[PDB]
Design an enzyme around this catalytic site. Structure first.
Site, PDB file in Angstrom:
ATOM      1  N   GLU A 170      11.167  34.100  18.305  1.00 63.63           N
ATOM      2  CA  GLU A 170      10.973  32.643  17.577  1.00 63.63           C
ATOM      3  C   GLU A 170      12.315  32.005  17.089  1.00 63.63           C
ATOM      4  OE1 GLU A 170       8.340  31.177  17.738  1.00 63.63           O
ATOM      5  OE2 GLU A 170       8.754  29.312  16.509  1.00 63.63           O
ATOM      6  N   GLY A 176       8.033  21.794   6.526  1.00 61.66           N
ATOM      7  CA  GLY A 176       9.674  21.099   6.306  1.00 61.66           C
ATOM      8  C   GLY A 176      10.608  21.885   6.007  1.00 61.66           C
ATOM      9  N   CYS A 210      11.010  24.867   7.682  1.00 63.53           N
ATOM     10  CA  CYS A 210      11.569  25.742   9.108  1.00 63.53           C
ATOM     11  C   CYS A 210      12.804  25.268   9.451  1.00 63.53           C
ATOM     12  CB  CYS A 210      10.437  25.204   9.974  1.00 63.53           C
ATOM     13  SG  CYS A 210       8.930  26.093   9.700  1.00 63.53           S
TER      14      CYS A 210
END
Length: 182
Positions: free
Chosen positions: A72, A146, A148
């Site tokens: 990720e 928001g 991230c």
């Protein structure tokens, strides 16, 4: 308020930009030269906006472990006219647990946000939005949309970037020194 917030502020003020993709606005950590990181679900393309300026992406690599499992983290090289301060010496060499972490965000929606998240567990495997993911850190804070790309620090170490939550826990992808050797 204390040395945790002091280290976090020092990282945010010199080593973050606001990145905009077609998937939203993200906190983006600059690591060295023109190289930065962002969550892979930002879907970086050929062009990205950096502090509202159109910027060519010179290279972007979605990292996976040697079992071909998602991490990720996307490493982005930006066609920017200025280098980041080199913070690679603040990155951990190995997977670990941590005490007394701060999650720090800077976006249009959440400028100058600092959250004391406390104890961080080396969680390991997480099914993140349906995608098997490795090297996940977990903290018991109810993180929201928001945050991230938010930088996870301890005093003296930059340990991860926020990639999700379940309403009760928040999750970060590890940053390791070995990702940014040159």
């Amino acid at each position: 308020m204390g040395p945790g917030f002091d280290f976090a502020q020092a990282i945010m003020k010199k080593n973050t930009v606001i990145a905009r993709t077609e998937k939203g606005e993200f906190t983006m950590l600059g690591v060295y030269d023109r190289v930065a990181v962002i969550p892979t679900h930002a879907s970086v393309g050929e062009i990205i906006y950096i502090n509202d300026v159109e910027t060519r992406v010179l290279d972007a690599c979605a990292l996976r472990d040697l079992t071909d499992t998602n991490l990720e983290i996307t490493i982005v090289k930006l066609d920017r006219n200025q280098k980041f301060r080199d913070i690679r010496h603040f990155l951990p060499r190995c997977e670990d647990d941590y005490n007394d972490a701060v999650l720090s965000v800077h976006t249009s929606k959440f400028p100058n946000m600092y959250i004391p998240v406390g104890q961080v567990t080396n969680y390991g495997f997480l099914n993140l939005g349906g995608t098997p993911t490795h090297r996940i850190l977990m903290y018991n804070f109810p993180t929201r949309a928001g945050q991230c790309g938010g930088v996870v620090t301890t005093t003296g170490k930059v340990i991860g970037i926020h990639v999700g939550g379940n309403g009760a826990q928040g999750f970060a992808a590890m940053l390791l020194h070995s990702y940014f050797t040159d």
